[PDB]
Symmetry: C3
Amino acid sequence: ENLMQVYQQARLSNPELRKSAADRDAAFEKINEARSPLLPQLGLGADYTYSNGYRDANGINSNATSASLQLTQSIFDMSKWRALTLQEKAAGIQDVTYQTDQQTLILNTATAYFNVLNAIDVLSYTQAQKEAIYRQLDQTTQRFNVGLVAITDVQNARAQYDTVLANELTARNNLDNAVEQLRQITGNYYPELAALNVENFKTDKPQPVNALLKEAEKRNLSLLQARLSQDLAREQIRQAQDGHLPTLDLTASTGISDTSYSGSKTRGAAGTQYDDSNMGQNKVGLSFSLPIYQGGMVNSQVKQAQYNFVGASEQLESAHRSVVQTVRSSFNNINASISSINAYKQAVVSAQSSLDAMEAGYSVGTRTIVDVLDATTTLYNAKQELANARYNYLINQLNIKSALGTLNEQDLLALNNALSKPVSTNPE
Amino acid sequence: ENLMQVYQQARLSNPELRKSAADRDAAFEKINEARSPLLPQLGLGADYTYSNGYRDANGINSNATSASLQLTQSIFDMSKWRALTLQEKAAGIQDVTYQTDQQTLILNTATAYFNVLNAIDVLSYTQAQKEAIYRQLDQTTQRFNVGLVAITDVQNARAQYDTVLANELTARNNLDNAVEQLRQITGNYYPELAALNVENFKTDKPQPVNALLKEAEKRNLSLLQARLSQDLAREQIRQAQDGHLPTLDLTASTGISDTSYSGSKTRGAAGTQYDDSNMGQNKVGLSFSLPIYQGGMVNSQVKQAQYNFVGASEQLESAHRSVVQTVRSSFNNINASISSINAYKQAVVSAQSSLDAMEAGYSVGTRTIVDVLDATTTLYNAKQELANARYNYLINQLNIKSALGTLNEQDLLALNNALSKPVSTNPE
Amino acid sequence: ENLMQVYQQARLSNPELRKSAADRDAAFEKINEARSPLLPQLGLGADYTYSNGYRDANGINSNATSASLQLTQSIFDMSKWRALTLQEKAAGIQDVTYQTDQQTLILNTATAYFNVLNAIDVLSYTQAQKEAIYRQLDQTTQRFNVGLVAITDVQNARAQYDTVLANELTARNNLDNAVEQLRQITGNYYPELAALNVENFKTDKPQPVNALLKEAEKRNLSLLQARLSQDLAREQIRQAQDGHLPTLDLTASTGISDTSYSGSKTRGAAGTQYDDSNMGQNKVGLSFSLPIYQGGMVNSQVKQAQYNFVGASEQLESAHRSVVQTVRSSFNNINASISSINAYKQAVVSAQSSLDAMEAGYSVGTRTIVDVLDATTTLYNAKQELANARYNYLINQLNIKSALGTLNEQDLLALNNALSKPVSTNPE
């Protein structure tokens, strides 16, 4: 019904933003996977075996039956902590992109609303045009029958009347397409939308350029993601270096087994070596490692990290200059919109004066009714142009708010106060 | 040189589809790779060693030589089966992409075929306009040199003539570029192509929108691939829980090793402990292992998989909305084409009257040849626009049917009745 | 100050090209880590272990300690050589993309340079139009005050004045944005730039298309990329087949150990078997293996590699076709530009004549000052067209040289000879 309600529904219905939220959640979950290797480990290895001697070594047999648990726990390894830092950076990146997605959704909802309104206005204008052209065709046909013109004039009138029929059909197709494209965002059919009230339309002047640029350089999203990217590149440089550092880990276990034997040929001159025995082992101990002369395996891995970091630093500079140009362009666009609005208001007044003149002439009997209809068509065209300009101005203010990096739902709340009168999308 | 003969060769010459076929064949053959690990594996293990004890074990020399074979057969580990399921689903996705590429090939070939003929028509119009503009220049120059006209008029006529010459050059270049575009798809240069048979054109009517929507939901390619992706995500979730499952393997090995003992200490009072032996080994056994805690890593992979699944579901919903809006748009486009065809038909009906009236006046002597030529140019304009409208209608029919996903080559009678005598592509 | 200087500054100040260089450096450095697995891989170890396993031996204490080195050196394996070759091919690919980035930088700088002059021309002519329309409004308002026209005609003049005001504002904003976009390439603000020298402009004729095609086949960067990628696919096919051949390795080690026990019960009539030891060993040996049966792993890789090879061949064919098409399209754009230049020259001459006629008529009193202002505006616009045409010709020559694959600073130098007139980028 209103813009606020439409956005409220689209917020909790839209699938793209929900995909962004799901991706953020799955990314925050990778932190747990990062820490897991640090914590202890536990396993089991029970098994069995059967040997056999041959090639003059027959008559000797054995039976293995093992079962043991194992605990492993690392006590010093800096590589693992690098992973946790990197995962935290990834979580930050995901949050930033989620914010960008929300802002994009706000922009798209506003754009769809205003597109629907513009379609309504254009449809009305084309209907008026069709009426005028039909009236003109009737006059020309009536004159030809009377005997004042030739067949070619009637043919031209019919062509002009046929063209407007195609334009009228196209307008309805555009309106239906706009309604469906709004449903694609919101997910619902909206018979009516609130219309702009001209009594309280705002044309406030914007702030200086340098202030806007300075504020944007603080809480913008693209450059924030660039900064986080450079930080994770540095964290990636740290990770590479720790490949040539020693580490320690602890190992523990316990197990039992039975190792009885059997056989006839085994008997004889055993010498106590062929006796059944049961045994267990409970080894526990630490370990250490340290690499040397690896052919610069990790040494050359470090140089790759530094080049990547300088590339990230270059991308950040590119992002900075891009933000500069974008904000400047948005500001100039706002100014152009103001000027265009003024021009269109003047045009509307001129058309109104012409229509009044044409109507008075007809009332006194100096003009036909085709002139009245043509004047009406011109006035409706001017009204459509003015409405389009107003909608573009509102969209541009929202766009500069987005470029600044400070777009929310409370900002859009104010715009709702400019929309008062309901209008049907497909009136009967 | 009709569409069918051009498309038959395009089918077996187009590298865009051939790459898709190669990708599908790579995807399919890859399954046999994933079934390899389950089967048994054999290998050889010969090697050599040499040792020299020190510290307590001084003066002890030894040398060893061994060689054996190994064979491991996985008894129960579903991890490998889930790989097969995932890979077959990947093959399905690839086949869907192949179907999409085939439809794309068909549509692109048809579009290029019509573009060539459109270029030819506009070229003919430009030639007529050039002739008319030249006859105007001659008229003005003769007048000026006899009087009746200032020089500025001569220069204006010269300017118009130069402009039409530039347009003619542009049209020739466009005609060559479109042919080059027709050689880039099919792979052959076509000097002559068939054209539309105007006397047998069909302005058919489309089916209701709801029936198209149902057919699309049932048999559309994009949403089918999306459903395959959703099933793949579920299978991946099933694969995540596979971690907790225990695994066991059956391994058997055999080999020989003949080791001899020597040394001053060994000789003398050996006591049978240091005597040489020539026994073999035929070890056969099993193995079983299962994780107990693992620090909750799998309990995190399970949640990552669930988040991925919900993201895939959101993607599928988005694709559904997209297909709905696309089918609606295509239907509206067909209707718009019908209306435009009617409008242009009336427009050409009208222009014929004026060129007919200009000719009679010259026959009696009320007009000049310049009027006749200008009328001819206008009618040529009415002729080039109508042909463009017809070609657009045909392409839009193909587009709606492609949105339905139901066209590969059943456009046999669709265009066969629409062909006519050959028309050259690059006349000289 | 001028084109050559701007390019010189951008050659080293442009971040995109520097990122490309960083990528090239990363690719070349990668060769080092492919070499590394050939050299010896020395290492160090050390681990204590306490054990009291007592399935049958209760009260036995046996600590353990060890510390040893390691060395490994591969003898025969073609898994590493293939990696070296493939990394070299990747480096070549990176070099080619770097060269492409160079050419892109030159093109972007030239386009950004010419857009500023276009903006200057547009601004001047828009200001002239504003002056003319203001004089028209003054005349109309005076006439209405005198009592010769109706109020309706005043509104039209006011509307036109507002429209021209808006157009002028848009022109100024476009000039500002074009200045900013050139700073996004070089990082500097240019108060003034050099303009074209009209009396020193050349109109050459392009070389025959066959020679251009031959040169493109010789030295087109994208085709070089395609051929290198295909070679990289063939070498990968060779790599896959090499998973069959056997492998040979050499290892060596040396270390110590204590394995000291304790306990009163152990001491006494132990038979010397349970006494503490301080043994040491320096074992060294080789290790060989040759696979026999691996399943479809060996078989499937080769078929997949061949499929990838045919895919690469298809991609190369696409590259060839695209190159030919682009060469012809640029070659034709050149001639189109020549023709447009001729047409706009004629238009300028015609406008000059009209202006002179108007001026003489006003000198003798047959015309109002308003008429003169309009002719000046028409002439001024005619120089907007002719200026924007020559810049298009230069840009098109630069593009065709780029497609030929021979675009260097030497080529860009030839343009600057025609730019020998400074002009401000911000009038008043």
